[PDB]
Amino acid sequence: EFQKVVVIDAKGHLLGRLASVVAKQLLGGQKVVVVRCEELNISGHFFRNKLKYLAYLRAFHFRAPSRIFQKAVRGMLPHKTARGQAALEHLQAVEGIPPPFDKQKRVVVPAALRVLRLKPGRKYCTVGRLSSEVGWKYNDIVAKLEERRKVKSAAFYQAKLAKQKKIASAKEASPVNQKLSQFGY
Template sequence: MNSIDREIVVDAENAVVGRLASKVAKLLLEGYRVYIVNIDKAVITGKRKRVLEDFTRRLWIKSNVNPRRHGPFKPRSPEGIFRRVVRGMLPRRKPRGKSAYKRLRVYRGVPASLSGRDFIVFDDVLYRENPYGSVTLYEIAKSIGWIPIEERVGG
């Protein structure tokens, strides 16, 4: 089997983060190299205020020894947040989980190297309207202090 046959490009636009992460973790453990595009448009369901408070509260957890040197280190970018969710679904301390995690690539938008490829959209992970709403990973990342590279360079 060709190595390109074992590669999957997944479009995360309007996908629920947890559902998508579980599918991706399973594919990684099966040996696929998985590329995720448009991760900033993926959503977490729930009331906006509650979701943002939960992510902000997680940042308060610090080490008593030396918070800058000893963790826990929390990701703030949309890519980092999604990678951390997938990492929690893998046996990351075992060789099988480590190699699976290395095969994951996550991108905001669509990089030039993947623009000509066909994207897979999992229908069962797409967000369906509910009374509580949803928040995109981009909005969550901005609320916890992440600054997009476009804004950092432009200023």
């Protein structure tokens, strides 16, 4: 099932797997937005990606986690062609969750999840912490904003669940739900 706009929570996803999934979607005409890019995970110890980046530091050197992921997708696209540049403009990778996107459903990619792809006990790095060490200086405020949004969203879920309780109780109250329940619904 495909639609025009998807929001992907990047927490617990591997950088390469998620970018490759994202890149294939973009070339298919699907507008993709990736949020919480600083919770992205990378296989290997912290120093390994750290020496990878400082080698890259030794071209514009960008430190933000959202633009770290954007570079990963960019190498997986035909950027030299008008088709690739069109696809890239369809991708909006952001850190944290902007308010326009926190009120919408967020899907996850099972083929890219770290839990389903990394053996337990394997060391893994986080893009947010790696970026914060190479020059990024906004993880304090991003983390603080995350708590406020998480608190507000948690209250919304409680309100949604409380409203759900009434209809859930009224479901079995009506005898129609049990009159012809043989249909499987």
